[PDB]
Design a protein around this ligand. Sequence first.
Ligand code: CDL
Ligand code: PC1
Ligand code: 3PE
Ligand code: 3PE
Ligand code: 3PE
Ligand code: 3PE
Ligand code: DCQ
Lengths: 169, 312, 80, 98, 171, 347, 110, 48
Amino acid sequence: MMTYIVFILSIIFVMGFVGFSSKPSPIYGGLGLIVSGGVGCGIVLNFGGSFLGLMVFLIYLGGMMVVFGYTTAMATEQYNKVVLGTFITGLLMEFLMVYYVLKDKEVEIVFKFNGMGDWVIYDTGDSGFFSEEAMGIAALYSYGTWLVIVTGWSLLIGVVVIMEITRGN
Amino acid sequence: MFMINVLTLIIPILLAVAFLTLVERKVLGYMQFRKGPNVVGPYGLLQPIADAIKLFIKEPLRPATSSISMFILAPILALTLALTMWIPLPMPYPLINMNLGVLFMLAMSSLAVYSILWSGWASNSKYALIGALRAVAQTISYEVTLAIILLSVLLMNGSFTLSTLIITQEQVWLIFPAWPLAMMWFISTLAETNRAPFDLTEGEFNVEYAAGPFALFFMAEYANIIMMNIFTTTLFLGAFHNPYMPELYTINFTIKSLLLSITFLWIRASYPRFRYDQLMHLLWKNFLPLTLALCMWHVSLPILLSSIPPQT
Amino acid sequence: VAAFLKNVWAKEPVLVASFAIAGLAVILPTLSPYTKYSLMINRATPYNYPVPLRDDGNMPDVPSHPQDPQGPSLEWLKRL
Amino acid sequence: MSLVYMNIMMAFTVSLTGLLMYRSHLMSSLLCLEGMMLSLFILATLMILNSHFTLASMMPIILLVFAACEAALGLSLLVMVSNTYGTDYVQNLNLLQC
Amino acid sequence: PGIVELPSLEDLKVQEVKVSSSVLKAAAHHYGAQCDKPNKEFMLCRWEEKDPRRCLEEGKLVNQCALEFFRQIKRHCAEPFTEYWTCIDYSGLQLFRRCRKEQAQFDKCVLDKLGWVRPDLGELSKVTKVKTDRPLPENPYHSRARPEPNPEVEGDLKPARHGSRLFFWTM
Amino acid sequence: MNPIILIIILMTVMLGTIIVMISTHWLLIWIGFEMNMLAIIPIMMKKHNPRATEASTKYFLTQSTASMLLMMAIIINLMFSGQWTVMKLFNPMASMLMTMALAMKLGMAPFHFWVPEVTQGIPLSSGLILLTWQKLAPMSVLYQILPSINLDLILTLSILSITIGGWGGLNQTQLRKIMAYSSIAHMGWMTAVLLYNPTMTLLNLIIYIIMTSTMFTLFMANSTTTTLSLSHTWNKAPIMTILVLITLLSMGGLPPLSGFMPKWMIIQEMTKNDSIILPTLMAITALLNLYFYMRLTYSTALTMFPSTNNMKMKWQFPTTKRMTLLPTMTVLSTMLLPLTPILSILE
Amino acid sequence: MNLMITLLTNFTLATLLVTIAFWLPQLNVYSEKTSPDPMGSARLPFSMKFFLVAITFLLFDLEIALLLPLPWASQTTNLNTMLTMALLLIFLLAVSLAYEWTQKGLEWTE
Amino acid sequence: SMMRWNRERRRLQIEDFEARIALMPLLQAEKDRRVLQMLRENLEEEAT
Ligand SMILES: CCCCCCCCCCCCCCCCCC(=O)OC[C@H](COP(=O)([O-])OC[C@H](O)COP(=O)([O-])OC[C@H](COC(=O)CCCCCCCCCCCCCCCCC)OC(=O)CCCCCCCCCCCCCCCCC)OC(=O)CCCCCCCCCCCCCCCCC
Ligand SMILES: CCCCCCCCCCCCCCCCCC(=O)OC[C@H](COP(=O)([O-])OCC[N+](C)(C)C)OC(=O)CCCCCCCCCCCCCCCCC
Ligand SMILES: CCCCCCCCCCCCCCCCCC(=O)OC[C@H](COP(=O)(O)OCCN)OC(=O)CCCCCCCCCCCCCCCCC
Ligand SMILES: CCCCCCCCCCCCCCCCCC(=O)OC[C@H](COP(=O)(O)OCCN)OC(=O)CCCCCCCCCCCCCCCCC
Ligand SMILES: CCCCCCCCCCCCCCCCCC(=O)OC[C@H](COP(=O)(O)OCCN)OC(=O)CCCCCCCCCCCCCCCCC
Ligand SMILES: CCCCCCCCCCCCCCCCCC(=O)OC[C@H](COP(=O)(O)OCCN)OC(=O)CCCCCCCCCCCCCCCCC
Ligand SMILES: CCCCCCCCCCC1=C(C)C(=O)C(OC)=C(OC)C1=O
């Protein structure tokens, strides 16, 4: 049970997407995507990506879904069958996938997937006095020069484009 | 045994928040040439207990909520994020010693605006929603300088580890190389917690909550106030740590954090409120340009002095 | 260049301090003599293992023991 | 392959079909689009952390930033729609049939 | 494919260095100075063979040379060493900087009774050279023969015969 | 719009397309498409009316969906190949998803459903950019992934694009939708010869860009967006009727004009590969495109529709519009077939 | 594991306090209240300026996300390139702020 | 003050890293015998 925990989080992750892909309301959709971002962050944390998971909190949830809920709260003036039907449809599809891959230890929807817990695929060594993920992100400034140029230029152009298309003139 | 440690974290947080209300009313009393509460308890010490018993037996205000679920979740999220901002705080040892405690705190404080936003939309008042949008925009505005000032200071630390930030400040307080970052940090954390002179929620969002849940929002806000003062203390006024006697560090950072919380109480009894555009002007046109300039200075400065801190 | 600078320091001192601190941050690492020592300390921090070489017969400058005289020295780092 | 990749891909396809079957709102569409981006973040992250390919650890951050900027653009588009009709309904966007 | 060949359990039996990490870190610099040679033989064997099964006996020499390092501490300087690794052992990050007088007593006692000198800052990270008698691996990756490349272009470049030959274009 | 900001935004569009063309990493391909979309959005909203905002919303939704499918194809490529080279794809699922994503970016059928909408909603210059410059980067990626493109998929997309872009323009009186359905048909023509000889793909792309730029430049010179407004040209500018005549007779693939050049060469590279049914059906379906080109030439050049009285005022003002490269493009889009073996410069 | 226990404990304490706040004064049998705002019933007017400060937050927070690996990036061996790209990112954040200034984007929430 | 103390901290970091480097041959030999032990145990249990 605890050796399958990432898998269990991933199941919640799929459930969370059916929490908003059925689209109940964009505010309940925002709440479902927040819970989905939290559990997917936990999945990232359990392979050792602490910095990437805290980017999911700080930038995806605390940065961007804040703006989604903010913009949504400035619309949809405050006060379904298809929503609940599609929700239970996606839920039953996902639990049939769970039941198949747990009774067969093998499944094939589009790709073949193993049924054991995903702890098996890990590495058995140490990385010394660094996180390899942290040093690969620190490499953005020495090795990642062209990437920083094009990303900063796209963000500057993004500021310019947002100011152009919202002015109305 | 770890559960006992979690309880000895979270219950004294609630007690210190309970008596911070008394310290606020007393310190604002004596700064206003009057007294604070001194009748209900001996030297007023039973005033928060009386007030908590008063609020929990007051009639529920019974609003017509837009969403019941978010009306329940906004105090839950506010209290949960108010309590989880304490677990990486090194005093001198944190509850959860993690490699990225600074970034964890910045993330869990970035998540705090959803409580304001959900409480504003879950009320049926459009006025409460406008106030919630103003408070959310204010908080997410000052989180920008929180992140950049915090990054610029941690360029002298070497890591996002909060426990390394005590080792960083064993020869000098970090306010001496970084007092402009310190003063903009201090005003920005004053603007995070909707605290005066940045309290436009009291100047003419959770007004539809009953006395119980409004008291829970209030105590989550004061837990954030005590926590950000402790985080500012660890971040700029790092105390001496003897590893064989940790209580020296604990007494020292407690005295400094109490002085800094009294400094919040001393700011709120000294200044009038900003207008909303005036603190937007304060962020985007005063704090953020100096914050970016000092971020360039604290990037280029350990390289030009050969003072790059260690990674580990 | 003189009246303009006093005018912008009288009206907008936050922006003058901003551009002054940013200008020092740009130009001063190119003029500092201690910028080289940052490079020399960061390349002297041994994150990995110093994987030794097979002594083929002609390596006069590679030591056989860490306490041998030949090899890279960090007396500049101790002394400074 | 690994079992968590099944769930992250199936989450991407769930948010795909949510983004490919609108109900009424453009905001719910953008929510499904950013769910797709989130699932791509998780999946690229689990690959790069799996294989210990160090230099690609900066890759999903980039995949965040651009696409989050993309989201900002879409939100502004939605606002211009909501500055014409009063709602963000996708059935009001049919002036280009003729 | 083939069967992987693992060594037997008799090949893995060795007198294990059963000391704690603070005992290792307290005795680390003198271990890196005094147990240099079979350690570097082993690590050169380990980065050249790229296979731990080919590096076992050298590792035994490591596990032989480490123990003679500690017995020679235990025969002469067990008390200042114990006082030093206890103070190293107290710390959570195991700081050397908290434990300088115990290090001074241990280094004084080792320099007197055993003549060992602690390595200066920058020495144990030097890239050294190892004189071995084992042969260099001619194929440490077990790589097969690479495919032969495509033939190059060569010779002088004559013009196109009768132009482009596109249906009727004479040039 | 500020002209400096317009120059920076057009350079950012060109920069994103160049970053797609010159990069060897898949993340930089995705970054080039993101930069290209993010910069082309204000070019569509230049005149600020609800049709431009609706068109930009539809364009954003389709290109965002295509970019997400592109990044999913890239991520599955990293699964099954462990690396990031912009080359062949090491999974047919990633190959299918990337071919779908690029088909959505090009507007190939049945993902064509945004091209006649958005081109109608935006000005003629932004539609010129959308139908000429925005075809460059996905065709570059399709040029570089063709050892893994499934044959039946690309040929299905090609014939479906040719047939749907042929039957689209027969019902159209709006010129921008005519150019949009012409775009869908010609992109089907480009991707049909893709796996056989991509040099003819490049030749078809260059000749199509020349002819489309000629037609949009004539539309901007005459300020006409409908067939019935284009019919007023003979009473105002009689030379422009001759120019739209020869350019629309070129775009239908009529010899001796240059627009006969690509499709003939496409047939010339498909009968070598023993495909005889498919270029025959494609050539017969191109007669639909030529039919509505002939409809436009009948309305504009070969007859004289009645004009109004106010046209007599416009006789007294010459064209002050910068008709950039219009003689050069008009000559190149008509009289280039005797230089047909020049195509070897694209090899 | 200790962190998951801590998060579960904090969520459980918060939910317990919220349940006591929403259900202890419900047991009061006070009275039924008959017939339980500056705007009466008008719709919420959309403010363009609130959306502008939110998107400006989002874009500058993305630039912050680029700036966040700098305490690790100062440890590199390619320090001239690192210093150039760090000053270039903070400079592009400042150029974003200056363009937000001079095209009247920071107005009435300055 | 931060110049002097971060330089001292870099020297202390290099000292700790060379303590690690002096320990890495023994830890590598024990790690090799550890994984070969576990693989031989898995091999014999697979055979039975
Ligand atoms: C001492 C130092 C100095 C030495 C100087 C030596 C030369 C002295 C004389 C100086 C002048 C030399 C002129 C060039 C050499 C002769 C080229 C030639 O006649 O090729 C025959 C060429 C093939 O005949 P051939 O018996 O196999 O070769 C005889 C020579 O060995 C041909 O030699 P080749 O085997 O080397 O030819 C190579 C190849 C041979 O050709 C081939 O391999 C066959 C494919 C050719 C292209 C066919 C395309 C078919 C589809 C498109 C149709 C286009 C529209 C048709 C006309 C519409 C109205 C303009 O040619 C080409 O690929 C070039 C393309 C065609 C252009 C021909 C040259 C035109 C120059 C004047 C331009 C003015 C406009 C002309 C008409 C424009 C349309 C062509 O004839 C044709 O293809 C028939 C088309 C018309 C040819 C143009 C006649 C040139 C003189 C025109 C004067 C009247 C202009 C009236 C006003 C403007 C028009 C309204
Ligand atoms: C951590 C412990 C505490 C830290 C200190 C904080 C305690 C004191 C708190 C006092 C009460 C504050 C109540 C709220 C006040 C909010 C208003 C306010 O102050 O606004 C800020 C004001 C805002 O400006 P303003 O509104 O006063 O001025 C008018 C501005 N215009 C013209 C734009 C309208 O000032 C700032 O923004 C300054 C921020 C800090 C500046 C730091 C500069 C350091 C020096 C740099 C170098 C300078 C020399 C040049 C280069 C030399 C190179 C060698
Ligand atoms: C970490 C430390 C945290 C500390 C937090 C708390 C700080 C303050 C602590 C309390 C200080 C003293 C409080 C005294 C309150 C007044 C008591 C009193 O005098 O009550 C009198 C009242 C009537 O009595 P009666 O018999 O009528 O008197 C007539 C005499 N002829 O009789 C009564 O009212 C009945 C008796 C009531 C007793 C209540 C006592 C206060 C309880 C407060 C809760 C906290 C307890 C301490 C926790 C920390 C220490 C373990
Ligand atoms: C609407 C719903 C209800 C709303 C109220 C409640 C939810 C909101 C408030 C709670 C937010 C919870 C945040 C959980 C993750 C925080 C990030 C984190 O764990 O960082 C700490 C640490 C990284 O530091 P590091 O030192 O690298 O790790 C140890 C190894 N050296 O990482 C670790 O130590 C990793 C430890 C193992 C992995 C832990 C995974 C936790 C469970 C998944 C996430 C839980 C929250 C899901 C919902 C979030 C909704 C916002
Ligand atoms: C090259 C170094 C690096 C430069 C880039 C990095 C900068 C870091 C700081 C970030 C700044 C971001 C914001 C910049 C906005 C600039 C435009 C601006 O503010 O113009 C308006 C202002 C007058 O204000 P106003 O519009 O009236 O405001 C209403 C309230 N009264 O107008 C002014 O106040 C005039 C401002 C321009 C002149 C400033 C001169 C400062 C000189 C300092 C000494 C030399 C420093 C070396 C660098 C010089 C660079 C020019
Ligand atoms: C393997 C292939 C690799 C790649 C090869 C090269 C591909 C070239 C692709 C060309 C794409 C052209 C896109 C459009 C031009 C870009 C600049 C632009 O936007 O020009 C339009 C501009 C807008 O002006 P505006 O003020 O908006 O006018 C509205 C009316 N008041 O101004 C106007 O409206 C002025 C009117 C005339 C404009 C004519 C522009 C013609 C441009 C195309 C030339 C032909 C292409 C180059 C040669 C062939 C190469 C293949
Ligand atoms: C059970 C643990 C305590 C629950 C919370 C109740 C006590 C703390 C908040 C009460 C409060 C106090 C003391 C208070 O003084 C006050 O006025 C400034 C409030 O209203 C804004 C309060 O809400």
